[PDB]
Design a protein around this ligand. Structure first.
Ligand code: CHL
Ligand code: CHL
Ligand code: CHL
Ligand code: CHL
Ligand code: CHL
Ligand code: CHL
Ligand code: CHL
Ligand code: CHL
Ligand code: CHL
Ligand SMILES: CC(/C=C/C=C(C)/C=C/[C@@]12O[C@]1(C)C[C@@H](O)CC2(C)C)=C\C=C\C=C(C)\C=C\C=C(C)\C=C\[C@@]12O[C@]1(C)C[C@@H](O)CC2(C)C
Lengths: 234, 216, 41, 231
């Protein structure tokens, strides 16, 4: 099968049944089978959340170039309530909704087929499916076969996870959005890479400062905004 | 047989190579008794894991302090800095909290040593399988090994056991070096490393001042 | 190690350890609490 | 091999002529194990070819630009005047390091996977029709041998390669030590020896380390040292 390192050997606990199985497990994290199933569900949900986040960051940077996505919570709209404390109501609503939907997903994982019935309307029922791939009303149209689409989903999700890590780290080291950093790299390719402004030799070390402030004052809360392991930066 | 600490010398006859990191090193024969050997194996594992955590928590803040990003105090001064910066948290209260928490976890570990698997009865909040223990000094389970790196394969477990014991011994020797270098230079370990890297022919133990008390 | 611990369990060695502990406890009590004559605080 | 490195010595039992340039020379016995011998043969091949290219580059650069010290060729102002892009087109050396790091990580991981398992990365990963024959380890061929010079006596041309590579490695060590002792290029050293043989040789330069202790390259200070404690 396609291996992350061609010519190498896949570990024995990765047979190739899972979508996107390229034999990449050098640490042996998935050698326990129930841990492998749990980590497959975790990879799927991480991939989908990172896909949505990367698409949202790109769109809301294209739509609003004057708003930093790192600082987008400070300038977020407030369509509900006339008070600055209306964020706690939105937090409560989000916590209730995500608790419901994630408990539904988790109990589908532990008990397969248990959460297939609509709790309100007993006629509505999801058809029988696999764990982590609900289908039914969640997938009204499937443009193609399931296995190739699953491979496409996991590949795009891994790319989006790497892209979100890049978005975060570039926001810390540049203080600016993704496509602006891409334009700065396109303007000066030789002098904008991480290898350009960061050099560590045994003599001395040059570490770029992070432009994000260490804290912000959000209605008298003083939210800490630490640069992610900035002392270990090159 | 296996590789030994002194090539050409036979290993200690009470060390048969079953334990991780067995290089046959027991010149004082302190591990002749098998029960005392299990006790000393738990001692070495606890010392090594504590040393590994301590050396990481000394080195990474000191590396970050050397780069100028933060101003975390050196390891020999952090208790004083914490006490001076926390007047509302008395030393005795912090010590009491540490003593009761460590006493709870260490008494559980001790009672598991006396009777293995005895903490698996569900008396602590219904925890049954996770407190059973895999081997002497290797608890495992879903709590202590949540990634399941010991439940995958046997050879992977032995490789990780060798990694753990060798890095633990290295960290213990490193902490001894931390003590000796602070007593000789009055500076942090990353400060000592930076001073050595700046000019290694003149920054040596022979030039600190206390390793060679004479003028020379 | 068993024979060495049996030697440490002999009566003069046990007496030395116990009397060192007791004498040290009395010495450190009289150091931390100098001149105790009565049970008064 | 048959002709040995010294008269009267005997070859080790694991060195009797499989490899080219086998003179039965292993005083430390490092090639006693076949896996270690294969790894060290790969190391000798890449060291030989890199020293080959290095000696060719050092000799050719003194023909074209005799006024540039090859020891100082890494300095940004000793670079050729070319446009690296940006506001001024000046070098940055970070992106220059990044290019080489990425490309050489790819090609050397490919070579490493070849060394671990023979004929395991012969195929082109993208265009699967393309393939490398790889008759022996360290000798890939195909697009690496376009003129097909290995179709004849493979052992003889392998012997030529390994012997020229050993000469190139010794010559590169001589280049480095001469540049550190004199502060001049190799052909300048040869001309100085040809001018005054008894007044300019190793006995007059071995005590001096002409390289400065440290240099400053666009904001960072790289420490420098000779290969011996000269002053
Ligand atoms: C994981 C999902 C996700 C989260 C948590 C956010 C987070 C946020 N977005 Mg982004 N987005 C997300 C997915 C997507 N977004 C966008 C496109 C946008 C735009 C165009 C804008 C946001 C804005 C916002 C902020 C306020 C949203 C609001 O008030 O809605 C209430 C309903 C908030 C910080 C707004 C802003 O304040 O930041 C620039 C804004 O103008 N998002 C797209 C493409 C349609 C997504 C998919
Ligand atoms: C053997 C383990 C170990 C011990 C004994 C210490 C000891 C200490 N650390 Mg270290 N560390 C240790 C491992 C590690 N540390 C660090 C990274 C750091 C940093 C970056 C800092 C310390 C600091 C401190 C000091 C104050 C701790 C505190 O305020 O707790 C706070 C504990 C809580 C708030 C409770 C924890 C939550 C719990 C679930 C309830 C104290 C001397 C600080 C300092 O040097 O002096 C003030 C400091 O800035 N540690 C890493 C990585 C480790 C691995
Ligand atoms: C067992 C690990 C351990 C070790 C090796 C040390 C050793 C040390 N303590 Mg620390 N402590 C340790 C655990 C703990 N300490 C403290 C609380 C303190 C305080 C409050 C202070 C030290 C200081 C010191 C340093 C200087 C002591 C001295 O004699 O200065 C001579 C020295 C590095 C102090 C020091 O630096 O003196 C200025 C200092 O003020 N320690 C607590 C309470 C939570 C600990 C928990 O186990
Ligand atoms: C070099 C470090 C190191 C290594 C290789 C191991 C290896 C092992 N540990 Mg140990 N440990 C190590 C350090 C420490 N351990 C422990 C405490 C424990 C417990 C309580 C248990 C283990 C267990 C295990 C086993 C299974 C888990 C595993 O494979 O982790 C693999 C480790 C790595 C892949 C390295 C991870 C590096 C890490 C990300 C760096 C973090 C640095 C930060 C500054 C902190 C295996 C023998 C279990 C058992 O003993 O076997 C059944 C178990 O129950 N370890 C502490 C104290 C917190 C340490 C410090
Ligand atoms: C076995 C008897 C015995 C007991 C119960 C103690 C008890 C104590 N000694 Mg003591 N010591 C004892 C025998 C001896 N001590 C010492 C030398 C010391 C020193 C040098 C110190 C103690 C200190 C201490 C205290 C903290 C440890 C604690 C009160 C320390 C202290 O006095 O307060 C922290 C301290 O610095 N002891 C010697 C060598 C002569 C002994 C024999
Ligand atoms: C039977 C005879 C006799 C009695 C009743 C006492 C009684 C006393 N002597 Mg004297 N001694 C006696 C014979 C001798 N003494 C001495 C030499 C000394 C000296 C030099 C000192 C005493 C002191 C003391 C006092 C110790 C109190 C104490 O440490 O509380 C501690 C209580 C406990 C340890 C109880 C256990 C509690 C547990 C650990 C928890 C106590 C009044 C000391 C005192 O200061 O004088 C008044 C003192 O400095 N004795 C010698 C020569 C070796 C004796 C023979
Ligand atoms: C690999 C072949 C190679 C060789 C033999 C040399 C040789 C030399 N270079 Mg050159 N370079 C080489 C490649 C490159 N150089 C440069 C750019 C420069 C510059 C800017 C300079 C040199 C200089 C030098 C000279 C002094 C070296 C020294 O003493 O520093 C001391 C050496 C060290 C402190 C260690 C250096 C390498 C060491 C053997 C370890 C290898 C590095 C590993 C990646 C370490 C891994 C790090 C991990 C932990 C992440 C010497 C003639 C200097 C000079 O003298 O010019 C006047 C100088 O200023 N070179 C680039 C960037 C395109 C290279 C690309 O590969
Ligand atoms: C912003 C991007 C950028 C721009 C506008 C230029 C500009 C130029 N460079 Mg440069 N470079 C740029 C990025 C980089 N270059 C280089 C490395 C080189 C080299 C080695 C050379 C150029 C050369 C050239 C010229 C090639 C014209 C031609 O006929 O090609 C067809 C052109 C003026 C050439 C030149 O300077 O003279 C012919 C040349 O030899 N570039 C690197 C490192 C790999 C870059 C990153
Ligand atoms: C056993 C041989 C031997 C040893 C241990 C030394 C030791 C030393 N010599 Mg000497 N020499 C030796 C043989 C010879 N030397 C020299 C010619 C010199 C000179 C001209 C100088 C030294 C210098 C030095 C010192 C600096 C290192 C150096 O320059 O390397 C030289 C390496 C070799 C000669 C390799 C053979 C060092 C104490 C220097 C000194 O006197 O002060 C710093 C210095 O300037 N040596 C010749 C004639 C070619 C030798 C035969
Ligand atoms: C060296 C060591 C052990 C050495 C023992 C050896 C070699 C034994 C060898 C032998 O027995 C054998 C095998 C066989 C026998 O026949 C012969 C001998 C030769 C006898 C242990 C160290 C072990 C060292 C340990 C446990 C380290 C832990 C220290 C801690 C917790 C430090 C914490 C903090 O430093 C932080 C993190 C932050 C700071 O700011 C504050 C503080 C609190 C100071």
């Amino acid at each position: 099968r396609a291996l992350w390192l061609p010519g190498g050997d896949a570990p024995a606990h990765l047979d190739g049944s899972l979508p996107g199985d390229f034999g990449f497990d050098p640490l042996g994290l998935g050698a326990d089978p129930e841990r492998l199933a749990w980590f497959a569900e975790s990879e799927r949900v991480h991939a989908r959340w990172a896909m949505l986040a990367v698409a949202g960051i790109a769109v809301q940077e294209v739509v609003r170039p004057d708003v930093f996505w790192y600082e987008a919570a400070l300038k977020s709209p407030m369509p509900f309530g006339n008070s600055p404390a209306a964020i706690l109501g939105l937090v409560a609503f989000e916590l209730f909704a995500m608790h419901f939907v994630e408990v539904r997903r988790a109990y589908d994982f532990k008990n397969p087929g248990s959460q297939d019935q609509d709790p309100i309307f007993s006629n509505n029922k999801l058809p029988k499916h696999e764990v982590g791939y609900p289908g039914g009303i969640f997938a009204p149209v499937i443009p193609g076969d399931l296995a190739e689409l699953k491979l496409k989903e996991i590949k795009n999700g891994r790319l989006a996870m790497l892209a979100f890590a890049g978005f975060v780290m570039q926001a810390q080291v540049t203080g600016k959005g993704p496509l602006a950093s891409l334009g700065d790299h396109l303007s000066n390719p030789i002098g904008t890479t991480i290898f350009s402004k960061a050099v560590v030799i045994p003599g001395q070390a040059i570490v770029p400062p992070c432009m994000i402030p260490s804290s912000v004052e959000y209605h008298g809360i003083t939210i800490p905004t630490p640069c992610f392991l900035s002392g270990l930066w090159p | 047989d296996r590789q030994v600490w002194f090539p050409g010398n036979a290993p200690a006859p009470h060390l048969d190579g079953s334990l991780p990191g067995d290089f046959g090193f027991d010149p004082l024969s302190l591990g002749s008794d098998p029960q005392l050997l299990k006790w000393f194996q738990q001692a070495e594992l606890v010392h090594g894991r504590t040393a590994m955590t301590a050396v990481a928590g000394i080195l990474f803040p000191a590396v970050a302090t050397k780069a100028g990003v933060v101003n975390i105090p050196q390891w020999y001064d952090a208790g004083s800095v914490w006490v001076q910066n926390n007047p509302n948290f008395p030393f005795a209260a912090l010590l009491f909290i540490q003593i009761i928490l460590t006493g709870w976890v260490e008494t559980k570990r001790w009672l598991d040593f006396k009777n293995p698997g005895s903490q698996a009865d569900g008396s602590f909040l219904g925890v049954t399988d996770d407190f059973k223990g895999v081997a002497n000094g290797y608890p495992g389970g879903k709590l202590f090994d949540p990634f399941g790196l010991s439940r995958g394969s046997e050879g992977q477990l032995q490789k990780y056991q060798e990694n753990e014991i060798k890095n633990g011994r290295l960290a213990m020797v490193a902490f001894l070096g931390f003590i000796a270098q602070h007593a000789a230079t009055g500076k942090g370990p990353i400060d000592n490393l930076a001073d050595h890297l700046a000019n290694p022919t003149a920054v040596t133990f022979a030039t600190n001042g206390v390793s060679l008390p004479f003028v020379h | 190690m068993k024979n060495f611990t049996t030697y440490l369990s002999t009566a003069p060695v046990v007496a030395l350890i116990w009397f060192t502990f007791t004498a040290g406890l009395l010495i450190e009590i009289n150091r931390f609490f100098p001149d105790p004559l009565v049970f008064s605080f | 091999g048959r002709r040995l490195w010294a008269p009267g010595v005997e070859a080790p039992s694991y060195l009797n002529g499989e490899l080219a340039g086998d003179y039965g020379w292993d005083p430390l016995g490092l090639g006693a194990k076949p896996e270690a011998l294969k790894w060290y043969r790969q190391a000798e091949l890449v060291h030989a070819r890199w020293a080959m290219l290095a000696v060719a580059g050092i000799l050719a650069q003194e023909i074209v630009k005799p006024g540039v010290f090859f020891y100082n060729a890494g300095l940004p102002e000793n670079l050729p005047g070319i446009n690296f892009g940006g506001p001024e087109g000046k070098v940055n050396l970070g992106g220059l390091l990044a290019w080489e790091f990425l490309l050489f990580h790819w090609v050397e991981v490919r070579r490493w996977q070849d060394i671990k398992k023979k004929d395991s990365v012969n195929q082109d990963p993208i265009f699967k029709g393309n393939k490398v024959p790889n008759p022996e380890l360290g000798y890939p061929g195909g697009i690496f041998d376009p003129f097909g010079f290995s179709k004849g006596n493979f052992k003889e041309v392998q012997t030529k390669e390994i012997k020229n590579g050993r000469l190139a490695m010794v010559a590169f060590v001589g280049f480095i030590i001469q540049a550190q002792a004199t502060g001049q290029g190799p052909l300048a050293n040869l001309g100085a020896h040809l001018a005054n043989p008894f007044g300019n040789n190793i006995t007059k330069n071995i005590g001096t380390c002409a390289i400065p202790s440290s240099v400053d390259v666009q904001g960072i200070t790289i420490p420098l040292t000779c290969l011996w404690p000269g002053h």
